[PDB]
Design a protein around this nucleic acid. Sequence first.
RNA 1: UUUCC
Length: 664
Amino acid sequence: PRRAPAFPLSDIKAQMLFANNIKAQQASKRSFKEGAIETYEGLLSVDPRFLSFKNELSRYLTDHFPANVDEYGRVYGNGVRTNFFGMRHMNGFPMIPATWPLASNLKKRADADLADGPVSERDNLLFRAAVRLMFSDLEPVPLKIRKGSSTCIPYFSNDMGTKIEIAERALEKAEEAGNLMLQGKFDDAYQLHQMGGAYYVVYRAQSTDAITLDPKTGKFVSKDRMVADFEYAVTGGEQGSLFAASKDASRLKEQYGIDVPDGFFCERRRTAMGGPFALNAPIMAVAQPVRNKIYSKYAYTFHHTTRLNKEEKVKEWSLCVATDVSDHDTFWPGWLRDLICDELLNMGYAPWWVKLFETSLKLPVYVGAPAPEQGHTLLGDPSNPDLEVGLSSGQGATDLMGTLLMSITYLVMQLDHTAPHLNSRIKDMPSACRFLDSYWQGHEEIRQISKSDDAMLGWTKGRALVGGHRLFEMLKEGKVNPSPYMKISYEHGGAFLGDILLYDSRREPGSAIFVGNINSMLNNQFSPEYGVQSGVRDRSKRKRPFPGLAWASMKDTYGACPIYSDVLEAIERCWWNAFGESYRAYREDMLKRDTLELSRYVASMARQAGLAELTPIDLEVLADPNKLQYKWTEADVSANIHEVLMHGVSVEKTERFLRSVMPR
RNA sequence: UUUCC
Ligand SMILES: [Mn+2]
């Protein structure tokens, strides 16, 4: 196919993406930046003591607590699934270069042998039924906005007052914008209502990534992460190249004079996309009600809170298969965007709104700075959005899009390889809807719990069970992809939304339990993805508002991990060796300070009443709001806490907008 | 100095 058109920042098509204000102009030109993060107040991620501590702790834990994962990927025993070398990165210094995002993934899907559409009429009915059950009996709620998040293109505002106006104006003009777009007038819709333009592409750190220690050599080896250069991204991989980014941290020595201990590497960087907020608002105003619906009526499959919440569902199963999807977002199929839109139109959704939604999934991307001297290039033409990047992370319903794709993909897997007898129940729209409605409520012999690309597939006793074992066996074999839609395999060390499924000697769901992933405690405490941003006065606007609070929820979140005690002690000990102080005491102080600071933000918080009213979820979220993105939902957090992090647009304004969008 | 329960 066509190479995607590309425009340098100086071109008028890219200039038009940035308003005439300093923030926007700076965001367009920002060059590649790196530097140690402030892991905790006053402590840099590359401080020699800190790196010395990480070297001792990581070797020690790996030594004493080797992974306990069987050949079917189930974890048992110490609850450890891999070594602990993941903490060995110079946080804040990225691998170079980061990837150019692929402008079209059609070829990437075809070459991996994935389908370019529903392969059978049955699958077509199931994807559409997913749309009818998800988008149908919605209740308006206010549109909530994350504090301090940017409106990206074209204003790049972080001001709540300005964001609320942008959103309200957007709900008011979405209809006119959509209609413009239905007429092919995208430049007009963008110019008049800022609905269009591009996603603003930033690079985020995945702070821990695999590292192994080669026994032969005595040297550590970091996992290679492949990246696409510009030619490759704009040609969907037909030209250019895909190569291993460089994680070597040696350079930090001559560049910054930072001492780099042996076996420490640069961080894996991932692309992140900020959507043009005027376009996302009208999408988010539908998305939230959709979530409220599936997390209530289809709570069994989609609403996951605690380890025990998950556990209750899974222990009733006779077989539990922990799947893995490779690179979900970039393999996500545009044909599903078109199928969902087509079905929304059949259900009676406003065409103008469907068009806004369709366009949000075909938008050009403005690439910032993947490496020193590269970037500042707009991929795709905003005048006629036609990219196929897969799923953009900043689209307003990204989680729902991944969840609809995968939930149906895993059901198909179960039907295809284990439950042929259920096919006669899926004959037309009504029966598809009935069957999927029952399956999602956990009422069938095949079940699943999922969220985007994480899931656990279940079989109760019955006809499908024997097929379930053959599927599992097929996955263990790993030679044949069990799905025509995405690359599915089994998770090496089964886990679900952060909890590892700990199996005893019987290796059966009924006697298994969900424990916290101890390695994640270590990633969160010693390799955060951001520094403490102590320069940002308003903590509610920071990426890590109250880091100290996580100490208070630690026992609750990881206390069930078998080596919990051991890990806390190895930490205390290495921290002693490295810093001459008690880590525990260090965290109790951090805990007290943040606990006090938090009352400055909580109205109902007696200007010093404890943390008495806060749940463990509340605490993890206050220390790391990102978990509200990949793990929990607004509804899982105390309302007074929710207000610290979010602000809403009037219920009356969203209600009126939603009435003009929905069928009935 | 920049993203979506
Ligand atoms: Mn998993």
